[PDB]
Design a protein around this motif. Sequence first.
Motif, PDB file in Angstrom:
ATOM      1  N   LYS A   1      11.804   6.810  -3.926  1.00  0.00           N
ATOM      2  CA  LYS A   1      11.848   7.547  -5.171  1.00  0.00           C
ATOM      3  C   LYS A   1      11.172   6.624  -6.172  1.00  0.00           C
ATOM      4  CE  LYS A   1      16.307  10.040  -4.811  1.00  0.00           C
ATOM      5  NZ  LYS A   1      16.191  10.475  -3.406  1.00  0.00           N
ATOM      6  N   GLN A   2      10.198   7.148  -6.907  1.00  0.00           N
ATOM      7  CA  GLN A   2       9.476   6.347  -7.891  1.00  0.00           C
ATOM      8  C   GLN A   2       9.350   7.098  -9.224  1.00  0.00           C
ATOM      9  OE1 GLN A   2       6.046   5.744  -5.077  1.00  0.00           O
ATOM     10  NE2 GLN A   2       6.513   3.563  -5.337  1.00  0.00           N
ATOM     11  N   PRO A   3       9.255   6.362 -10.345  1.00  0.00           N
ATOM     12  CA  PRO A   3       9.130   6.975 -11.673  1.00  0.00           C
ATOM     13  C   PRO A   3       7.854   7.793 -11.842  1.00  0.00           C
ATOM     14  CG  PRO A   3       8.564   4.689 -11.806  1.00  0.00           C
ATOM     15  CD  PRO A   3       9.203   4.892 -10.444  1.00  0.00           C
ATOM     16  N   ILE A   4       7.971   8.925 -12.532  1.00  0.00           N
ATOM     17  CA  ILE A   4       6.838   9.811 -12.765  1.00  0.00           C
ATOM     18  C   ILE A   4       5.738   9.181 -13.622  1.00  0.00           C
ATOM     19  CG2 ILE A   4       6.081  11.974 -13.800  1.00  0.00           C
ATOM     20  CD1 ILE A   4       8.741  13.202 -13.109  1.00  0.00           C
TER      21      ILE A   4
ATOM     22  N   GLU B   1       9.865  11.029  -8.518  1.00  0.00           N
ATOM     23  CA  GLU B   1       9.013  11.681  -7.529  1.00  0.00           C
ATOM     24  C   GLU B   1       9.412  11.133  -6.168  1.00  0.00           C
ATOM     25  OE1 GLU B   1       6.156  14.247  -9.612  1.00  0.00           O
ATOM     26  OE2 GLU B   1       6.902  14.045  -7.551  1.00  0.00           O
ATOM     27  N   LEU B   2       9.541  12.014  -5.186  1.00  0.00           N
ATOM     28  CA  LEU B   2       9.890  11.572  -3.847  1.00  0.00           C
ATOM     29  C   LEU B   2       8.609  11.223  -3.095  1.00  0.00           C
ATOM     30  CD1 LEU B   2      12.565  14.166  -2.667  1.00  0.00           C
ATOM     31  CD2 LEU B   2      12.929  12.014  -3.861  1.00  0.00           C
ATOM     32  N   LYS B   3       8.671  10.183  -2.273  1.00  0.00           N
ATOM     33  CA  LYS B   3       7.526   9.791  -1.474  1.00  0.00           C
ATOM     34  C   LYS B   3       7.965   9.641  -0.028  1.00  0.00           C
ATOM     35  CE  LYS B   3       4.364   6.817  -2.740  1.00  0.00           C
ATOM     36  NZ  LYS B   3       3.752   5.537  -3.154  1.00  0.00           N
ATOM     37  N   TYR B   4       7.439  10.497   0.835  1.00  0.00           N
ATOM     38  CA  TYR B   4       7.767  10.440   2.245  1.00  0.00           C
ATOM     39  C   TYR B   4       6.855   9.416   2.901  1.00  0.00           C
ATOM     40  CZ  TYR B   4       7.182  11.825   7.189  1.00  0.00           C
ATOM     41  OH  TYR B   4       7.059  11.860   8.561  1.00  0.00           O
ATOM     42  N   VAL B   5       7.451   8.447   3.585  1.00  0.00           N
ATOM     43  CA  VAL B   5       6.681   7.411   4.262  1.00  0.00           C
ATOM     44  C   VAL B   5       6.956   7.449   5.757  1.00  0.00           C
ATOM     45  CG1 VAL B   5       6.251   4.943   4.526  1.00  0.00           C
ATOM     46  CG2 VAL B   5       6.670   5.881   2.261  1.00  0.00           C
ATOM     47  N   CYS B   6       5.940   7.821   6.526  1.00  0.00           N
ATOM     48  CA  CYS B   6       6.071   7.880   7.971  1.00  0.00           C
ATOM     49  C   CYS B   6       5.584   6.561   8.564  1.00  0.00           C
ATOM     50  CB  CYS B   6       5.245   9.030   8.543  1.00  0.00           C
ATOM     51  SG  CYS B   6       5.309   9.079  10.349  1.00  0.00           S
ATOM     52  N   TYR B   7       6.518   5.655   8.835  1.00  0.00           N
ATOM     53  CA  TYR B   7       6.176   4.357   9.396  1.00  0.00           C
ATOM     54  C   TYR B   7       5.992   4.526  10.900  1.00  0.00           C
ATOM     55  CZ  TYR B   7       6.114  -0.802   9.064  1.00  0.00           C
ATOM     56  OH  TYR B   7       5.739  -2.124   9.027  1.00  0.00           O
TER      57      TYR B   7
ATOM     58  N   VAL C   1       0.802  -1.218   0.000  1.00  0.00           N
ATOM     59  CA  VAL C   1       0.000   0.000   0.000  1.00  0.00           C
ATOM     60  C   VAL C   1       0.842   1.278   0.000  1.00  0.00           C
ATOM     61  CG1 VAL C   1      -1.855   1.262   1.156  1.00  0.00           C
ATOM     62  CG2 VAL C   1      -1.842  -1.232   1.175  1.00  0.00           C
ATOM     63  N   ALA C   2       1.887   1.309   0.821  1.00  0.00           N
ATOM     64  CA  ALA C   2       2.742   2.485   0.891  1.00  0.00           C
ATOM     65  C   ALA C   2       3.363   2.802  -0.472  1.00  0.00           C
ATOM     66  CB  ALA C   2       3.831   2.283   1.936  1.00  0.00           C
ATOM     67  N   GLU C   3       3.761   1.769  -1.210  1.00  0.00           N
ATOM     68  CA  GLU C   3       4.369   1.982  -2.521  1.00  0.00           C
ATOM     69  C   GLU C   3       3.364   2.208  -3.641  1.00  0.00           C
ATOM     70  OE1 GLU C   3       6.578  -1.755  -2.734  1.00  0.00           O
ATOM     71  OE2 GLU C   3       8.404  -0.652  -2.179  1.00  0.00           O
TER      72      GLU C   3
ATOM     73  N   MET D   1       3.135  11.726   0.135  1.00  0.00           N
ATOM     74  CA  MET D   1       3.391  11.411   1.534  1.00  0.00           C
ATOM     75  C   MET D   1       2.420  10.359   2.057  1.00  0.00           C
ATOM     76  SD  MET D   1       3.273  15.458   2.072  1.00  0.00           S
ATOM     77  CE  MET D   1       1.648  15.288   1.366  1.00  0.00           C
ATOM     78  N   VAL D   2       2.955   9.386   2.783  1.00  0.00           N
ATOM     79  CA  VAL D   2       2.147   8.308   3.328  1.00  0.00           C
ATOM     80  C   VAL D   2       2.377   8.113   4.818  1.00  0.00           C
ATOM     81  CG1 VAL D   2       1.552   5.886   3.171  1.00  0.00           C
ATOM     82  CG2 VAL D   2       2.310   7.127   1.124  1.00  0.00           C
ATOM     83  N   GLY D   3       1.283   7.979   5.560  1.00  0.00           N
ATOM     84  CA  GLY D   3       1.382   7.750   6.988  1.00  0.00           C
ATOM     85  C   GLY D   3       0.941   6.322   7.275  1.00  0.00           C
TER      86      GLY D   3
END
Lengths: 480, 480, 480, 480
Positions: free
Chosen positions: D137-140, D471-477, C426-428, C434-436
């Motif tokens: 980091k993921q492809p646009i 694209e950057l993706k911030y993931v707050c685990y 899910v996060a990916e 931004m994902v929490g």
Amino acid sequence: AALLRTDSFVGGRWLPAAATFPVQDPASGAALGMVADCGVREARAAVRAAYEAFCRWREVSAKERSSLLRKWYNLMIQNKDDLARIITAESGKPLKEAHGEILYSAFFLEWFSEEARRVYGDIIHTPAKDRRALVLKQPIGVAAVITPWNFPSAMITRKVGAALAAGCTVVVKPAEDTPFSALALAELASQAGIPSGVYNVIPCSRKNAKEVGEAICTDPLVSKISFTGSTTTGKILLHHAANSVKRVSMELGGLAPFIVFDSANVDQAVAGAMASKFRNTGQTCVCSNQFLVQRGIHDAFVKAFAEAMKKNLRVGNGFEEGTTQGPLINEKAVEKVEKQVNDAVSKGATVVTGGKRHQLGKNFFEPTLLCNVTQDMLCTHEETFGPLAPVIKFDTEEEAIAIANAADVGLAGYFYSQDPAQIWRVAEQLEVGMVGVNEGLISSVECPFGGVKQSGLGREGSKYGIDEYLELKYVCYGGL
Amino acid sequence: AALLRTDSFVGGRWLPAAATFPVQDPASGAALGMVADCGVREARAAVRAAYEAFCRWREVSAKERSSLLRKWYNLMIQNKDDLARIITAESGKPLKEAHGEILYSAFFLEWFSEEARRVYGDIIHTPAKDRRALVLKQPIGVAAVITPWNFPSAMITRKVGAALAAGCTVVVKPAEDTPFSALALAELASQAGIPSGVYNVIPCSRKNAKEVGEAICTDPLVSKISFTGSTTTGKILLHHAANSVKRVSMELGGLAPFIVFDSANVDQAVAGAMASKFRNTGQTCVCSNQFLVQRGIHDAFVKAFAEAMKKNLRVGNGFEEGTTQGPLINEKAVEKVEKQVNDAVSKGATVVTGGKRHQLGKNFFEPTLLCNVTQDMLCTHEETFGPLAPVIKFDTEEEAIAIANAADVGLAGYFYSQDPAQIWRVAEQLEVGMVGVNEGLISSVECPFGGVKQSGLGREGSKYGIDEYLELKYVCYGGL
Amino acid sequence: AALLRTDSFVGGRWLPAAATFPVQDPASGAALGMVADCGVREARAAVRAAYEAFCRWREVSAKERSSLLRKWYNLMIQNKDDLARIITAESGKPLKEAHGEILYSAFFLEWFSEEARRVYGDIIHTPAKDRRALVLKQPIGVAAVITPWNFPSAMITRKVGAALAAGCTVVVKPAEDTPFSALALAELASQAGIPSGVYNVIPCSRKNAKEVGEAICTDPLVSKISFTGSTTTGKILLHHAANSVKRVSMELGGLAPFIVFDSANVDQAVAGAMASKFRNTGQTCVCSNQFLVQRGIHDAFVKAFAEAMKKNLRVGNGFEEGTTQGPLINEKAVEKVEKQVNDAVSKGATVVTGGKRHQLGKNFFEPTLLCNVTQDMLCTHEETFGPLAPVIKFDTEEEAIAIANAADVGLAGYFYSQDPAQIWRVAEQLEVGMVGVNEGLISSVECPFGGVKQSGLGREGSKYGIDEYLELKYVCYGGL
Amino acid sequence: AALLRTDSFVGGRWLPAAATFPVQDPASGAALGMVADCGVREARAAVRAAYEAFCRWREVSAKERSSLLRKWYNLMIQNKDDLARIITAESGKPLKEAHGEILYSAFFLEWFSEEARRVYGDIIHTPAKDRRALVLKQPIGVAAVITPWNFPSAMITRKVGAALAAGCTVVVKPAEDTPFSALALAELASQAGIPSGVYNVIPCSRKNAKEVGEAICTDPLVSKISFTGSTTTGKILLHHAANSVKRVSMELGGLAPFIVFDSANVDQAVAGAMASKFRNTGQTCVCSNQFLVQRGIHDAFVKAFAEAMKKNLRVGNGFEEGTTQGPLINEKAVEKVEKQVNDAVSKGATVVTGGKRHQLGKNFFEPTLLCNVTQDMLCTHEETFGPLAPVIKFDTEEEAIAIANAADVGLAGYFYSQDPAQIWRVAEQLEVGMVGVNEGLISSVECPFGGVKQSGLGREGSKYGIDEYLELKYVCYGGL
């Protein structure tokens, strides 16, 4: 103030030892104080305090450790004048130079304060859609920090700042000649709120030095060793570290070539030579500069150099207005300088400006400049510090580089030139860890300092300094 | 083909030595060949060849060195089946595992081939408008590479690839039990066009091992040491390196905890345990896995584990179809395994699946699983490799972590769990350099491998591997 | 104090405009002040001031700019309570939330203060022995900063901090609803010593908004545009920027999916939902959360959610003890909320907790929770903020991801789960910036914030924020 | 071979269009072929193919995408001579230059092939012991690639290589003047195994250009736009992108200052000027060099420059031995050159070497050198390419920098000097994205290319190129 201390600092407390050793002003000979002379027992106790503090400190957030390091920095700035007087009192270096060191010392705490929140891990792509690869960075643990007398303050902060920023704790064993600066930092560490056991200082005299050095570099609770000093002691500690495979960063004293090429700006080269050899307000290294000058510019350089020495150097007490040359650290130091001068002359060298003890006597020696010096004249004096400048003539760039690259020499290097292409060649070919181009004072907390080959291991300061106190952890998150 | 070699490889040439030593198939006992037994004389000669090649190799463009490393990789892939047969012949490991190692080995050459063009320097801001700060990265020089028998190919390429990518040259001293893989790489290095002296291999027998090891780890021409093996030898080399302050990266054999928590997926944990302990097609480390299982899932795990051992493990010759368990490397190996089993049982341990020599005899031992094993039962066997799996029961996570964190253990770690929060706690608290989460085979050339504490120094593979062969040079471009 | 200002701030001076516009407390309706209503003329003047300041500011050392940014931070902390009261007075959000924003706002100045000294250039290897490759990073120049009313302080500092740390200057055009926070920052900027023209604020009313927005996003002296607001305005500014090819970073308001899976910890999911939707003390984004709950846990979740709303939400004035829900910003806001509620119900939706205007009237609306909501029920309300929570049921993970990934939605995302593998999937797969994971409040100055697709351009905060204000310069130093 | 193609390439298939447009050899006028003239319908179809391929391609491992990119590279090298002939046939540039471009073009595929496995995410420390911060980091997604005729091959690979390495797919719209190089790449992409829809080429004529350009820069399925061409078209595409907030990287044609200072090495400056303006075997930019020479060295420079033009420039057909100057692309091109020459002369300029159409006629113009040119003489010709070199004299460094920094000019810059300090000043003060020091040919795939201000957005090549497609993706685990 309450900055001058004589007790060791362990677990947030001031502790006296069974014995003590005297510390005297190298300029006047006056007694400065009786400092605790820690032995093996106290060293183990300090290690334990550092070890137990570690388990908690590693848990403190980077932002909090960052904040604490900054408070420690602010306290240094607030007391900078007294901190500078302490350096001058124990190391003898002129006040200006002392003020210069304190700034650098403080700037190291500030710099690592900022690095603390920037320890970044990685996320790496791996073929298997089965897992994800993570790389974490974690603090090594307890680090034994051993520093020389040359820069009694900056040598400690550049190490301890990095260590604490990474989340490690430390046990500091300062030089017997200059322990006050280490203890003054302790006073401010407590005022700043650094938790007990995070910063420990165990002063000790020459006779306890070996024993203590071995105790902390062999203790199972110590995981890292950081040393700056003589090659002899360094190799001894490296052996102690070998028995338990400890991480080590090291910087060993040696020679630093200062090359002046035909196209150099003479006055600048001389000014650089001056600041570099006689008025060093920095802290680059425990390296002594020696000069290589090209035939073409040789005479003109030597003449202008001597003239500047006569016009700017004033031997005297470091606290007095206008003093530019303080005393050597001790009688042995004077003797080593005398040795190099005499053996050089007895081999063809020519003295250009007084090469004998100063009329003030005691630990003062006259700023000396010798020419007609030869390559081989530097043997067995690779670690002789003092106001002594031997000038060696060379014909070609290739020649100068070969002379400079005499193995065993790999700390700092300097050279003056106005040829763009030559600048790149020499900078890359010089076998040292640091190079100064048309500049003799290259200290900078944001840049990496250290040596190559036998001059050391690791780097301090800059974005690379904190790595010496970190361990990488590869985490393969599978089951996906 | 012309891949099986018996001569040493120095300066691009095949050179026999005054003496030779036998290499036998660990499974059948058959003679594989008489390999050159290099002595001190030949080691110095190899160092000189590596040293002179360095002066030229460092000058080759990164793109060219990159290209050469890739050609070497392509040649490995082109000969991968024969290269795998050589590994199986000398190490005895089953073909599948051998094929697995070769891929990893080749992938290391390819990975560093790509790293070669990415050695980046820095430009740093400094307050003085007077200068600019540059940081260059340059190759250390000659590196002594010493590898174990466990992974006769991958252990060499991961080191040599990084070394060559950085611009260093190397002198390889392979394990007496498995020298062929090192020499096969040499044949391909020459076919690839690697310049003479860049890759040297000096095989030697047990009796010459010490002497040679000392020669290359002390030679003034060597600037870096890279070793993977026993703790005893490692500490001996570390002392040799201490005398000339050489850079060192090291990995010492030891135990690797494999923890199974109550929420783990049993079949997965078992599968992981299987692949991890008996069918390792990777090359993670010279680490032997031991199991810690939580009371709740204990019985179920042990039972399913044994059942899988009986269903999947087929002891026999590594070249034969369906072989899953090859022989131990030698008689001493069998003896050490017998020791651990007997002393464990004589202390309360219970054997679940045959714990004695295999009916085939020679170097074969039966895959063994013991339960009711206790923490202290692992003493003096921290470096005992073989198909032996002792299961230790624990009640709490805290308990398991404490057991696993017994100092001296800091290489790889593994654990199975389905609790997100627990996964982060254990992964961060486990004192090792590598952690596998719900996965037993974590090898990956793009990730950093190595140990913490006494398990080693430095990391190999990934973006960090090349740093072990580099020196930073701070350049203060002043005069502005 | 002297923190509440009504004049624009340009070139270090307080300047009134020809006209003014009223600012009223959204809770009480009370007049807060008559603020300068800057027009095109004043906007150009501000740009010029920023442009001339730039030429000097870019020349200030990174350490000095770093020091100034920190002083500005310290001043924010010293006045944090009054700064929080200003936010509550103009935005209406409860004090606690206001205090939370101020901390984040201050932390942004501090964070970039530290980033300022870490703008690193590169040294790259190129085949030709003829040259060396250098990469410098330099400030873009003047940046137009346009912020919304939602977070009247944090939205400005995260942008301006990065801009100033890079060496750029800025012209701030704050939201007409909340201009005070922008001017309070100005007062502190001058107290801190920020040079004149480095930080400019040009407040303006709705009617001048378009004109002014165009003036600064088209001026030849502006090289960068940073905007956070509605999609409509954002696209209009993007067109203005297109005519002179200006660099742009942008964040457009939208929906944020909050997914609750069957294995989630219910109380935690609810708590997260609560903090996320009703008690947001962060500043993540101008995103409104909407819920997707799996059939299995649905009923239990909805019930516990409503129960928490009844127990913790207290509608009232933001300055009063215990207030948890402040007013909407204006009458239009209330109307939009009413719209969404009514159209949802008129399509099958069920109200669980009061979905009408609050008995206090004015701008207060009752915290509303609706279930049986469908996917299509969210149309034309993608930018409707307010205490409204529609719950949409789903059966499968695939289903939930597809619903969430409705293009146009790419800012923040949240989800609760206890399945390790599901967490990574899910996060990916969630198409957002931004994902929490099992957390509803994910704000952090050290992490990158921004959107994907049409939700924005660029990121703010973290190590990547400063790049939005930098230009790379490749320098081929040849002639070697 | 089967390299020359006339059909569009979509979804792995060769598709003809309803119409076609002629492509003629700019030197001889001979017909090269009738190429498909894709319209809006075909453009949408190509976007769909790229979009559907993306969903699968993003899933392919980085190592596999890396491998595919390398195979594509190897195929380019294997067919490099024919690929070079195609460039010369359609662009008219001399074979040598064409061979030079092909190498660069191939090197871009190889470089990004290596970058593909190095897309690294981050792990960041946050105060709360409650969570961990991850950055992915993921492809646009799908990227529209639009390239000019100047470098019909290298301009495509530098973009497409980065795009594919990141995991994006592309739709290429090549220049009507040179579509063959784009289609030749397609043939090799299929031979390499690039999956269908990953690389699409939709050729189109001038009349379809606008329509098609709009279709792909507005399609909801396209998330990124990459353009290299005229400022006019660039601003038009930027507006199309604005309506759906697409990510954009752009490079717009313009002037490039070539400054010669008094201390420069004359022959080198001239050689650099020569290679830079008349024999460009690189691909730096769609920038035309103009000269600024200091009074002191002026005369000597102009004289030596003209002498070199007479000795080395041979106008003729690009396929003929010794040709150094090919034809202009078309009649309009010749006209623009004539314009600049005539208007310059009619304002005081002096022609030093033939400034008229060549005796061969058609599209050939005589290499022209004019002096006494003034600053204002360059107006309305900022985008006039051709063998025309106007020399402008200046007195001081400050003067030269001011002239060069005329806004609208921010792509490449060049200058010759032998003063170390001057070299740093000019390199940092020159407002461009790329600077050449004592070197006129600065192309390098490992370095970042692009412009500042209105000359562009983003950079291509180097370690920064791949970021334009990520694209950057911030993931707050959290939940820990």
